[PDB]
Structure 1
Amino acid sequence: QVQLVQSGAEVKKPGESLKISCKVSGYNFASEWIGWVRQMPGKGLEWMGIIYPGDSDTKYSPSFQGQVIISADKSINTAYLQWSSLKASDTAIYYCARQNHYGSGSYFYRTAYYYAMDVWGQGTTVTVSSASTKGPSVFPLAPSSGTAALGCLVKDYFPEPVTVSWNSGALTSGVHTFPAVLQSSGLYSLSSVVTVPSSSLGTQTYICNVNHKPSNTKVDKKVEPK
């Protein structure tokens, strides 16, 4: 059926330019409005603008007017979103979506003709940071002096993501791995914790297994009480 396919994730430094794409199939690209939606991490949707590839008419939110350009090439069924100069604030996921119409078009489209975004692309992640690729430093979070908590802090890595397992996967019950947080330094960091019986601390060995494929790090850290 209808399908929207967006370009891949992008990692850029502030001041660099960027152009992301959405290629459509399964309908007449030239005769439908298509548009872009931004969703910053943890927050709601922001409508950015739509374009009608037929006559290249564009409608923007004033918040995005002058910051970006929406454009299309009907020759190849592709819609574009571009910045000439990126800011850290532009870090978000960007969705492209067909804005289809529903209804009869009574009174020459002025009543009973509703526009809604019915088909969406998977989204394109854009990370803006001064940081360069960097593997994580892993620090133990040690249990104090009958239930105990320990964990590991995975700090100052870039870009996402890391994967954390405990004792190479044998221990899953009770692990909470928190979502990563971008720090002011432009580097990510998260924590992974686990709760265990206080009795099992002398009798059980606990290891953080951390992988950061983008810098090719595999780390194993024993977390011992003291």
Structure 2
Amino acid sequence: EVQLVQSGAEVKKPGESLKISCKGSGYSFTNYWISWVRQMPGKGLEWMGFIDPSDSYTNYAPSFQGQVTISADKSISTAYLQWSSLKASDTAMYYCARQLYQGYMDTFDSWGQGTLVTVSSASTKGPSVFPLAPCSRSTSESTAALGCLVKDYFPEPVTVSWNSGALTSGVHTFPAVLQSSGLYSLSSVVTVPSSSLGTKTYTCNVDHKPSNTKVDKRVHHHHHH
């Protein structure tokens, strides 16, 4: 089958160069053009440009002209996208796509799995983890919410489990927000029976692979401060 496989996620600092790749298989690489497409976090698709691998011809969208270089190496059926000097604003998912001309237009009939590029001046840092627990006398319903605040880490992602994976029902782990500090913060919460607050223990387990850290936090509210 037709397949485009892209290189792995990148985390870079502004000013650094970067070249990402897109390997085609299951077809004649030289016979189909390759487009690159940008998708900024939470945004839509933007066409960047294309290359014809048979003769190395390139075309760029106006806003990408002179900002990036598309290239190809047909001997290894690979297309590339590169920047000489990254900026934080280059943070995005990047896709390569095969063009199949049909109905007298270029269509993107096969897509790579995407390459996540994160560009930031921030340095790798594991999270601090803080309990989210109600004030002592505030629980006035049959169900209560508890949680963990996972703060000040870089880069994404973290993974959060509850009671070492035993607790999965009613868990909501929210999308991280990027703080003005350049570090991420997220919360994970769980709803449980209010009667259990004094009997059962609830602990969040927070893994952050990029910093090689793991933090467990038993969630409670101390009776003095």
| TM over 0.5, shorter chain | yes
Match of 1:14 in 2: 14
Structure 1 residue 4 displacement after superposition: 0.7
Q: Deviations over 1:190-211 (max 9, x none)?
A: 1101112222211221111111
Separation in structure 2 between the aligned mates of residue 76 and residue 216 of structure 1, nearest angstrom: 35
Match of 2:172 in 1: 176
DSSP 3-state at the match of 1:20 = strand
The one of 108, 118, 124 aligned to 1:117: 108
TM-score by length of 1: 0.91
Aligned letter for 2:121? S
Structure 1 residue 114 displacement after superposition: 2.5
Confirm or deny that 1:54 pairs with 2:61. no
| Pairing of 1:50-89 with structure 2 (within 5 A) | 50-89=50-89
Structure 1 residue 28 displacement after superposition: 1.9
**Identical columns (%):** 83
Match of 1:132 in 2: 123
Match of 2:200 in 1: 204
Aligned letter for 1:129? S
Match of 2:40 in 1: 40
Aligned letter for 2:34? I
What is the aligned length?
Answer: 217
Unaligned runs of 5+ in 2: none
Q: Deviations over 1:67-102 (max 9, x none)?
A: 111111222211110111111111111000101112
Separation in structure 2 between the aligned mates of residue 87 and residue 71 of structure 1, nearest angstrom: 20
Match of 1:190 in 2: 186
Unaligned runs of 5+ in 1: 103-111
Aligned letter for 1:27? Y
Structure 1 residue 45 displacement after superposition: 0.8
| Pairing of 1:205-224 with structure 2 (within 5 A) | 205-224=201-220
DSSP 3-state at the match of 2:55 = coil
Measured on the aligned residues, the alpha-carbon RMSD in Å equals 1.3
4+ residue segments displaced more than 6 Å:
none
Structure 1 residue 20 displacement after superposition: 0.4
Separation in structure 1 between the aligned mates of residue 125 and residue 116 of structure 2, nearest angstrom: 19
Structure 1 residue 225 displacement after superposition: 2.8
The one of 147, 151, 155 aligned to 1:155: 151
Q: Deviations over 1:101-152 (max 9, x none)?
A: 12xxxxxxxxx42220011111111010112211110011112321221211
DSSP 3-state at the match of 2:104 = strand
- Answer yes or no: is the 8 Å Cα contact 1:201–1:225 preserved in 2: no
Match of 1:95 in 2: 95
Q: Deviations over 1:161-181 (max 9, x none)?
A: 111111111211111001122
Separation in structure 1 between the aligned mates of residue 210 and residue 56 of structure 2, nearest angstrom: 39
Structure 1 residue 30 displacement after superposition: 1.8
